[PDB]
Design an enzyme around this catalytic site. Structure first.
Site, short mmCIF file in Angstrom:
data_model
loop_
_atom_site.label_atom_id
_atom_site.label_comp_id
_atom_site.label_asym_id
_atom_site.label_seq_id
_atom_site.Cartn_x
_atom_site.Cartn_y
_atom_site.Cartn_z
N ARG A 3 35.05 45.96 41.14
CA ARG A 3 34.88 46.00 39.71
C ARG A 3 34.84 47.44 39.24
O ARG A 3 34.23 48.31 39.86
CB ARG A 3 33.59 45.26 39.32
CG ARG A 3 33.62 43.75 39.59
CD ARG A 3 34.48 42.96 38.62
NE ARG A 3 33.97 43.13 37.27
CZ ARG A 3 33.02 42.40 36.70
NH1 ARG A 3 32.46 41.36 37.33
NH2 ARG A 3 32.64 42.70 35.47
N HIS A 29 44.98 46.53 37.57
CA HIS A 29 44.30 45.29 37.84
C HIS A 29 45.27 44.17 38.15
O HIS A 29 45.16 43.08 37.62
CB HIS A 29 43.30 44.95 36.71
CG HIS A 29 42.17 44.07 37.17
ND1 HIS A 29 40.93 44.03 36.56
CD2 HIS A 29 42.07 43.22 38.23
CE1 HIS A 29 40.15 43.16 37.17
NE2 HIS A 29 40.83 42.64 38.19
#
Ligand code: NDP
Ligand code: NDP
Ligand code: CL
Ligand code: CL
Lengths: 317, 317
Positions: A232, A280
């Site tokens: 993350r 991502h």
């Protein structure tokens, strides 16, 4: 007749509408994006699939038995007021694990082999042999030894890297030295390439910072150590990554996740030497995979079997 | 007293001089680069380590028992007039195999994952998610199943690729469909990423050409097939690689070897989209490794054991 599954997931609404045409075929779904559901009765609703849900959902659907995260992460859910004391199941796309390992191994190899330099010289039509140590001379330290980290470890080992691991509770993995939470400093001092595969919790927020980077191995076979994160983005302090690369504390980085996504156009990361950015997309699920996962867990639950991938509420992941 | 080993290798002369200070310590060496050896007597010489040797060497050293190649290849030796009928041992750096597999796996992953696109967008500060199939959806066809190809196959399989192989005589490899010489067209039609790990022989000269590229799989998970070569540069026709990429027959390429090295500055390959160039540094030996190999084979030979890595003269490799 089983009641339909409540679905409140903030993804492409048109995409979600399409998947839902074929999902949950024995019962249907309640798509909270549809205005026709503004006043829908959720008194019978058993299962909810949620990603960044509305704050009053649990007041509207008070008889839920199971919550399914729409993501691999549960930071989007875990902190919510009035979250009921029922199982929360995370989305573990059983086919995504292998794709995360492709990304991790590729990034480690690109740092081992000098892809940045090769590509810089290639663009300049320069023939420029580089020296790279064999993988066995380099230690990859994997932070997070869960579904993703244990697969990465296995594949990095086969490619020839020395691999060590770190997790909250020490794992036992043959051929791989593994460390407990409290042994972080020792683990960092042995690590040439740090691979981050941690969830976002309060304890891992802002975790990858200047102080941590200064603890990585300084006299290793790559010269300067490397930081890799695909967990993350809020686990890292990007301004510290930038400073560490500029000052030579880090030899480079590979990042799939960022504190703010999309990564701001003016971020210094984009053009930093020896830094690889992916937007991502290291391990994004095919759109049906979430629904197949939820359907499978419902089937287990309805046969009286245990739900899988249930999060540990007290631990936060 | 054993006689010194004859050494005639056209590498950095200063580097060779340095290694030879510590090599062959029971007998010494005769470095043919040294002018003091212009009229050296080779009547007692048993072993010669040769890379692009002088044409009259075998007249000067007529009592040789073994020739050692200074390279992994033997094209530099095999065609020479007056080559004696004694074993020729190729340089198989037992530690280089793993480094070739690092390169092959990295290149296959970079093509699978869209590194070219990722890097193009990164340089433009563009956030641009890409779609990549999982490795299992893509077939890597390895041409050459010798020391290097069998290691590459094993590691590609662990990463998740479907892998098939082709060699002069069909191999048996569990989990990997393998094909004989004559089945080339069938093998190419199944291949999405071609990995070349062949020696240079007359039969493999100019082998990777327009006609071959047009036989690779056209309807695979990468869209357009990819050509990878780390064997020998004279096995490929570079102008055909250029045409195939421009016309969309090949989706890209990765090349460590070239018809002429160094690659000409004006080659179109340098700036071709989706083409990765490494300057013949995929698997270059550490300078002592050749000498350790030769010393080990001499020890086996002097205990009466078989030499290893002996080339097949009739086959040419
Ligand atoms: N970039 C991307 O596209 C994707 C990113 N991800 C992210 O990857 C994360 C990891 O996924 P996954 O492996 O499946 O998760 P798991 O829950 O299976 O594993 C989490 C690991 O992190 C460790 N950990 C958690 N907190 C701490 C802590 N405070 N100190 C030390 N170790 C800690 C756990 O320790 P222990 O074993 O002791 O419990 C465990 O080893 C996900 O939470 C998600 O955010 C997931 C998919 C795709
Ligand atoms: N880029 C680099 O830095 C390096 C490149 N190389 C090159 O890699 C090459 C391969 O090395 P290595 O694996 O050790 O070699 P091997 O001799 O162990 O294996 C050669 C393979 O090629 C196959 N082959 C040879 N000729 C043909 C043919 N006409 N048709 C089909 N298959 C054929 C052989 O078939 P079969 O098994 O039936 O005999 C065998 O499988 C070396 O010759 C060298 O030129 C080596 C090291 C580094
Ligand atoms: Cl985040
Ligand atoms: Cl060549």
């Amino acid at each position: 007749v089983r009641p339909p599954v409540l679905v409140d997931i903030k993804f492409n609404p048109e995409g979600v509408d399409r998947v839902l045409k074929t999902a949950f075929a024995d019962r249907g779904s309640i798509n909270l994006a549809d205005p026709a559901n503004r006043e829908r009765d959720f008194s019978e609703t058993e299962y909810a699939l949620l990603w960044k849900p509305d704050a009053d959902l649990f007041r509207r659907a008070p008889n839920l038995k199971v919550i399914f995260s729409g993501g691999a992460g549960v930071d989007h859910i875990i902190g919510m007021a009035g979250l009921p004391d029922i199982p929360i199941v995370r989305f573990v796309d059983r086919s995504l694990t292998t794709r995360m390992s492709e990304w991790v191994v590729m990034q480690c190899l690109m740092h081992l082999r000098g892809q940045y330099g090769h590509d810089s010289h290639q663009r300049r039509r320069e023939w420029a042999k580089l020296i790279a140590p064999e993988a066995a001379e380099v230690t990859v330290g994997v932070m997070g030894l869960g579904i993703l980290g244990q697969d990465a470890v296995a594949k990095l080992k086969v490619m020839g890297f020395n691999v060590i691991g770190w997790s909250r509770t020490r794992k036992t993995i043959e051929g791989v030295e593994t460390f407990d939470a409290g042994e972080l400093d020792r683990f960092l001092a042995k690590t040439d390439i740090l691979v981050g595969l941690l969830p976002l919790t309060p304890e891992t927020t802002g975790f990858y910072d200047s102080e941590l980077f200064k603890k990585l191995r300084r006299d290793g076979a790559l010269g300067q150590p490397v930081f890799i994160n695909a967990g993350r983005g809020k686990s890292q302090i990007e301004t510290d990554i930038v400073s560490a690369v500029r000052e030579g504390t880090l030899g480079g980085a590979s990042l799939d996740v960022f504190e703010v996504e999309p990564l701001a156009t003016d971020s210094p990361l984009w053009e930093l030497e020896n830094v690889f950015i992916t937007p991502h997309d290291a391990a994004v699920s095919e759109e049906n995979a979430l629904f197949r996962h939820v359907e499978m867990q419902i089937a287990r639950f309805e046969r009286g079997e245990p739900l899988q991938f249930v999060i540990d509420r007290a631990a936060g992941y």
